[PDB]
Amino acid sequence: IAGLFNIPAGIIPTGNVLSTIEVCAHRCIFD
Amino acid sequence: VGDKLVFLEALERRVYQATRVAYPLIGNIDITFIMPMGVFQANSMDRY
Numbered sequence: 001i002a003g004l005f006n007i008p009a010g011i012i013p014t015g016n017v018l019s020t021i022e023v024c025a026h027r028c029i030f031d
Numbered sequence: 032v033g034d035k036l037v038f039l040e041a042l043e044r045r046v047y048q049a050t051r052v053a054y055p056l057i058g059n060i061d062i063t064f065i066m067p068m069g070v071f072q073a074n075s076m077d078r079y
Contacts, residue, residue: 021049
């Protein structure tokens, strides 16, 4: 099961993600 | 266009992007229709 690492886990992010769109519309690809 | 200089805007990425509000200019149009069903032309000249 997931959740072993802290979900926020505030640290130095690796890189920024683009295409800010509605992610809740499709969440089947996520784990 | 014509003889004037106008702005052209298609705001859908700067605004109304990744929100929960509908973008206007997508309104609807109601149209009615009418059809006869069982008319019978009672005449000897048009039943040809």
